[PDB]
Design a binder for this molecule. Structure first.
Ligand SMILES: [Cs+]
Ligand SMILES: [Cs+]
Ligand SMILES: [Cs+]
Ligand SMILES: [Cs+]
Ligand SMILES: [Cs+]
Ligand SMILES: [Cs+]
Lengths: 320, 319
């Protein structure tokens, strides 16, 4: 229960290289509902219909804007200067701390968005916490499977990352400093960790999902890059400058790191396989025992294949 | 099945800063057991009693020294120049590449040791993997399962034993890391775990890229469940992080009695000490040169938002 201001006021809100302006009216309480006391003014709404007259949902900051088809229902909270405009949907125990929800975005259950941006039609609904300069942007998605709308929905944690097209985030996944885009998926106790020097690139259809850890290195451009159908699958550990290509899966208690590493065609690392240095594994190779393949430094090992590496195979030089 | 070289020789061997030397005789095959062809010279032993005449165990490098009371048995395999001396034990599927077991070390089962060292009496026995410049130095010390030590130094009585993954860290005292624990140091900053701490859930203590950004665990302190500590973090006394919390920022010091437990988000140069529990959707961020301080007792749970030192209660008045 609140009332709309008597007089409007223009407001500006950034978009794509423009300075749009909208006539909003200030929201003002009337009775005490939750933690808002009767008489205190909150945010400025486009036209009562956005801020449901029911529930506890409320816009606290006197700068916050909600003006397109946006509808804030339930007990959702809007704490600081935010801007949700365009059939935006928020309405449960959702909490927006200082972000911007733009186009057809639906935030639900107990999700949390803080100082981040959610743009188009996507759905964030678990207990997902999207925060710290993150940028969610579900825009394209040509010819594949029907509007597989971009989803983040369980206990997924996105920190300073830019999730794009139709990506899915959902286990107890932890994503930090990375770029996930097309239809990639990360979703169990998966771990994505970039840093101030290198991000993490999960691209096409790739997926990360065991207790898998895809961490970035500190060397220049040490950017773990998952490119196609690839996937890190169990207790696997990928670190540093690596790029897993087409039909590639790393999954066991495998560990990959060090110099320029590339995996292509049909490759599998799955035992206690240890791979370090600049290695170029490319064809139908399998590495999965207690085997180790280590390229010292100015060296470079190149495993073409088909071939198997599983016993205490100690490779430290390219086959010939 | 093998004989001993005829004329002994002298092989020196590094120790605590000395150039000691022992008289040995080369082990030579007299048959075929695994992948050793008859009439091949392996490494050097002190007196047959070290390498077993049974099983498949064999010393493959003509430099490998095994000499005091080192008893190698079963199918043990020792591949590169190795130095096993004192009261060593090696007798199962174990594999030793280019390492040096030094004193009363006991390596069993499938364990692997590569490019590393093991000192005083300890026990390495699951399918544990110790590799790439690691340094085991017990002063009992146990690494036992699918553990993974990478270029790290484990001392005293530390236990490593689940599917735990250790890389570039220093774990000292009676410390323990043992489940799906991830310890990730790096070329600029190690990860230090000392006293009686424990990292044991899906917990993750990563290191920072900034200078001295070293995650340190120093007492009965412990990172548990689905936690994540990163950068310059130091956990003093009775601290218990765990759950879906997340600690990662500038100079962070957790003291007295602290509990980070929900979807906790602590970032920046934060100080939390007396009796505090930060366990809800709670966000505790300090932008930059900024520094937030949370004394305690105080419960920080609900959708609470903290970006400035709380100028009330336990902050402006102790006792
Ligand atoms: Cs990308
Ligand atoms: Cs594809
Ligand atoms: Cs490795
Ligand atoms: Cs230490
Ligand atoms: Cs102690
Ligand atoms: Cs955080």
């Amino acid at each position: 229960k609140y009332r709309l201001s008597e007089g409007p006021r223009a407001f500006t809100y950034q978009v794509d290289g423009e300075k749009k302006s909208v006539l909003l009216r200030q929201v003002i309480a009337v009775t005490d509902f939750n933690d808002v006391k009767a008489g205190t003014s909150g945010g400025w709404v486009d036209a009562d219909n956005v801020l449901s007259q029911q529930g506890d949902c409320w816009i606290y900051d006197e700068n916050a804007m909600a003006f397109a088809g946006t509808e804030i229902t339930g007990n959702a909270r809007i704490t600081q200067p935010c801007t949700l405009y365009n059939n935006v949907r928020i309405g449960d125990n959702v909490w927006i701390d200082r972000a911007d929800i733009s186009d057809g975005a639906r935030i639900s259950d107990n999700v949390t968005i803080q100082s981040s941006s959610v743009r188009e039609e996507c759905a964030i609904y678990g207990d997902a916490r999207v925060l710290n300069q993150s940028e969610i942007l579900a825009i394209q998605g040509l010819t594949h499977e029907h509007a597989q709308i971009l989803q983040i929905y369980d206990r997924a944690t996105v920190n300073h990352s830019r999730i794009v097209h139709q990506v899915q985030l959902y286990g107890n996944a932890t994503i930090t400093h990375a770029f996930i885009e097309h239809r990639a998926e990360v979703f169990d106790f998966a771990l994505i960790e970039g840093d101030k020097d290198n991000n993490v690139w999960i691209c096409d259809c790739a997926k990360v999902y065991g207790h898998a850890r895809v961490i970035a290195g500190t060397e220049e451009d040490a950017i773990p890059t998952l490119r196609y159908s690839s996937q890190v699958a169990e207790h696997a550990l990928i670190e540093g400058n690596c790029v897993l290509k087409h039909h590639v899966l790393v999954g066991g208690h495998a560990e990959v790191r060090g110099g320029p590493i590339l995996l292509d065609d049909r490759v599998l690392i799955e035992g206690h396989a240890c791979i370090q240095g600049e290695i170029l594994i490319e064809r139908q190779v399998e590495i999965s025992g207690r085997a180790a393949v280590i390229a010292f430094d100015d060296n470079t090992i190149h495993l073409r294949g088909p071939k198997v590496i599983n016993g205490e195979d100690r490779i430290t030089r390219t086959p010939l």
